[PDB]
């Protein structure tokens, strides 16, 4: 009937609702391409379907908020893969080597006193 | 095409071509193109003399321009210079006026660096 997974990337969440259907994908009440499409990496979000050849099996309704659009695309990449495993837990052995179910814990490193931006040091002369 | 006191921009867009006039920037060019009812994107070479004369009529006497402007400003300096005004003294010594710092980076007003010993 319906299947769900959350997924998250870099301070952004994307609720993935996979329902069997024509294959059309809806994002925030907009077409998948009316939100994206000017964004080259957008297609990387749908790679979990192409690994299991689930392109035409499922429709999708997605709610995205937080971060920028790129972290959202990865946030969608995980939510599609998290729901795809709940549908068939046998899809784990196929999905795992590609790492589509692995969360990316790289987050903006906190800015630190004495430096300019958390690593970059103020240049000096000595003379 | 001669619009103001002798001024011949050519082959570019008219609104940008008017910036070549002294008393005209992008603001006054967009206003002339506006009240004269002339397409700003049109090339200079494609301008009707009827649209040229209308541009001349407006621009020639709406604001003071190249010749008069240069003298008026130059007369505006002598005025504050002929009086004992401090602002005029900053003009005499060729130093900034608006109250910048003169310890460093006065190069624009000050006739760039002429070095001494230490």
């Amino acid at each position: 009937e319906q299947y769900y997974g959350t997924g998250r990337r870099k301070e952004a969440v994307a609720r993935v609702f996979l329902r069997p259907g024509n294959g059309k994908v809806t994002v925030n009440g907009q077409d998948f391409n009316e939100y994206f499409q000017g964004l080259v990496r957008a297609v990387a979000a749908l790679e979990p379907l192409r690994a299991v050849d689930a392109l035409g099996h499922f429709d999708a309704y997605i709610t995205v908020r937080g971060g920028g659009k790129s972290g959202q695309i990865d946030a969608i990449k995980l939510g599609i893969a998290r729901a795809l495993v709940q549908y068939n837990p046998d899809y784990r052995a196929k999905l795992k080597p590609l790492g589509f179910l692995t969360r990316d814990a790289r987050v903006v490193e906190r800015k630190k006193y004495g430096k300019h931006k958390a690593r970059r040091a103020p240049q000096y002369s000595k003379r | 095409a001669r619009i103001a006191g002798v001024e011949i921009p050519r082959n570019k867009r008219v609104d940008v071509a008017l910036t070549y006039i002294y008393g005209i920037g992008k603001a006054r060019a967009k206003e002339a193109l506006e009240k004269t009812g002339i397409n700003p994107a049109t090339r200079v070479k494609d301008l009707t003399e009827a649209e040229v004369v209308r541009l001349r009529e407006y621009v020639e006497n709406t604001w003071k321009l190249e010749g008069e402007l240069r003298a008026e400003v130059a007369a505006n300096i002598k005025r504050l210079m002929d009086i004992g005004c401090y602002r005029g003294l900053r003009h005499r010594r060729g130093l900034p006026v608006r109250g910048q710092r003169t310890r460093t980076n006065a190069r624009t007003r000050k006739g760039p660096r002429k070095t001494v010993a230490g």
Partner: protein, 80 residues
Amino acid sequence: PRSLKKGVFVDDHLLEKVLELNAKGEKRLIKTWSRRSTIVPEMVGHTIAVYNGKQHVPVYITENMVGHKLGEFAPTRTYR
């Protein structure tokens, strides 16, 4: 680019002083430590000593200089 926007400010020290001087005729040098004030038309013809922080300098006030402030003609710095 200079703006007081309304009620062009002039200190009350010399203001009540110069207008009363006009009643009795043009007076001689005057003491002024208030360069905060602007210049008004009724000052033309007088002579005002404005302070540099050190010295009092006599300034002849004319017609062309009405728009300015005292101290514009009493500079502070000393160079060369």
